[PDB]
């Protein structure tokens, strides 16, 4: 697979479509999330691709490495961490991420798996209290969708 | 991965979560779909997890050995040609299927593709026309989700 696509929604009104793609070595992360509250949204790759339960059966950060939680450029960081999106003051994030730790296939693969967009702000496993170092205390999950093979 | 999941969604009143798991060289698939019209609706994997235009973008059946549309105990069939659901009276198919065609690793890998539901019933290729070996009649997709990995 060299290509994916996301749909993400949830319960209110956020919703938006992310798409990826292997392009040499690595992977880009594009796409737009509309309906946010202006700022940061934590926005991280979850292990099931389950939705039975909402979001909330997607489980926790995708840790194939067993890390703690960190930021997209920390060497300690789940793979499923990309940081957060940042909504302007319409609502609207543009999302435009490469990251070299997740991809399309092998071990490493987010295919199948769970992209959600979060109620606050990541801080990146700095936050000092033990949540921070397992959600960087990014809150409940908006919106969220399983990610599938694209043409 | 040895299991998954997928929850099915459309336009109107069908909705369903079918189980996925891995038993050997066999895949077995369990689970519920509502909402359908008493008799027979054509049950198959279709190529792309793409959900963004509805079931429409989920392109046609798995096939990647490139055959005709058959039924599942055929030799000569799409690996996605699950044949057919049965609903009751009151709306409800109860799946159970066991399948040596599907799988949920390697290059026949269904993670990440979508389970289809259609209005109509699988002819299996037995129908007199051209349609009949490559979708078998089944017509519209009343509901579909990605399949995603579950723990
Ligand atoms: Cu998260
Ligand atoms: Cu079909
Ligand atoms: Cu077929
Ligand atoms: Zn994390």
């Known amino acids: 697979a060299t ?5 993400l929604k949830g319960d209110g009104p956020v919703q938006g479509t992310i798409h990826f793609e292997a392009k040499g070595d690595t992977v880009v992360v594009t796409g737009s999330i509309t ?54 003051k319409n609502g609207v994030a543009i999302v435009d991420i490469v990251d070299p730790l997740i991809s399309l296939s092998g071990e490493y ?26 959600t960087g205390n990014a809150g409940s999950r908006l919106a969220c969708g399983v990610i599938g093979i694209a043409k």
């Not at 290509?3 to 749909?7: G, L, N, R, T």
């Not at 691709?49 to 450029?73: E, I, R, V």
């Not at 693969?109 to 397992?134: A, C, F, Q, W, Y």
Request: hydrophobic share 25%; net charge negative; glycine share 16%.
């Open 109 to 134: 693969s987010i295919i199948g798996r769970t992209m959600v967009v979060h109620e606050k702000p990541d801080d990146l496993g700095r936050g000092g209290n033990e949540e921070s170092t397992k």
């Open 35 to 88: 309906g946010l509250t202006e700022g940061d949204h934590g926005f991280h790759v979850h292990q099931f691709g389950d939705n039975t339960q909402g979001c909330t059966s997607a489980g926790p950060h995708f840790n194939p490495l067993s890390k703690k939680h960190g930021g997209p450029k920390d060497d300690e960081r789940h793979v499923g961490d990309l940081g957060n999106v940042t909504a302007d």
């Open 3 to 7: 290509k994916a696509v996301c749909v």
